[PDB]
């Protein structure tokens, strides 16, 4: 699991969004596996505004942070699961790395800050949902 807390927002994987996330919906994108809900107290996570393709991500199946190089945000065909049917998820960055379903939520970080959260995985690869384009998060 896991989330990013920036300002008066909470950023989770859409498929893991709780009842309170839906009761306080701000923005959501099924094809991005993203959901933004509102928070009462002030979040202080810094979002990265960069062009990076190297980062370090947290992996709870190992309790380890991994240094990885990843692709630029794009459309990747994500196989069917119980949360979604066979579809193309947009804004997804792929890296060669380990992951398990319970790892969705771990953050990929660079020197600039928070790049995105773990979203997909399979075949010795791990995918991250990018959040760097969401400029409205800091205002
Ligand atoms: C090895 O499998 C995994 N590895 C990491 C995270 C997640 C998985 C499982 C996986 O691919 N998905 C299940 C949950 C929703 C995902 C999505 N965004 O479409 C797809
Ligand atoms: Zn960066």
CA 103/CA 116 separation, integer angstroms = 13
Resolution in A: 2.5
> Is 52 annotated in some ligand binding site?
yes
Q: Is 51 helix (H, G, I), strand (E, B) or coil?
A: coil
Ligand 1 pocket: which of 120, 122, 125 to mutate (most atoms within 8 A of CB): 120
CA dihedral in degrees (53, 112, 49, 123; nearest 10)?
A: 30
CA 49/CA 92 separation, integer angstroms = 16
User: Ligand 1: residues whose CB is within 6 Å?
Assistant: 15, 33, 78, 81, 83-84, 89, 99-101, 103-104, 118-122, 126
- Tell me the sheet residues that pair with 76: 89
Question: DSSP class of residue 124?
Answer: T
Q: Which of 34, 105, 32 is nearest to 73 (CA)?
A: 32
Question: DSSP class of residue 50?
Answer: S
Phi, psi of 31 (to 5 degrees): -75, -5
Q: Which bin fits 78, alpha (ψ -120 to 50), beta or left (φ > 0)?
A: beta
| All structural domains of the chain with their residue ranges | 3-44, 45-139
Identified catalytic residue from 21, 33, 103, 130: 33
Cα separations (Å) of 24 from 7, 27, 43, 88? 15, 9, 16, 27
Q: Which of 2, 119, 107 is nearest to 57 (CA)?
A: 107
**DSSP alpha helix (H) spans, 38-88:** none
- Rg over alpha carbons for the chain, rounded to the nearest Å, is 14
The angle formed by the CA atoms of residues 5, 120 and 18, to the nearest 5 degrees, is: 45
Ligand 1 pocket: which of 61, 75, 101 to mutate (most atoms within 8 A of CB): 101
CA dihedral in degrees (103, 135, 24, 109; nearest 10)?
A: 20
């Amino acid at each position: 699991s896991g989330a990013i807390y920036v300002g008066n927002y909470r950023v989770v994987n859409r498929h893991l969004a709780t009842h309170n996330d839906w009761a306080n919906l701000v923005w959501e994108d099924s094809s991005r596996d993203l959901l933004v809900s509102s928070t009462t107290a002030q979040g202080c996570d810094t979002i990265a505004r960069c062009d990076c393709q190297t980062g370090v991500y947290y992996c709870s199946s190992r309790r380890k942070h991994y240094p990885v190089s990843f692709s630029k945000p794009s459309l990747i065909f994500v196989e069917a699961s119980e949360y979604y049917p066979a579809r193309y998820q947009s804004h997804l960055m792929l890296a060669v790395g380990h992951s398990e379903p319970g790892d969705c939520g771990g953050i990929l970080r660079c020197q600039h800050g928070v790049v995105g959260i773990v979203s997909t995985g399979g075949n010795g690869l791990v995918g991250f949902a990018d959040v760097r384009d969401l400029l409205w998060l800091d205002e």
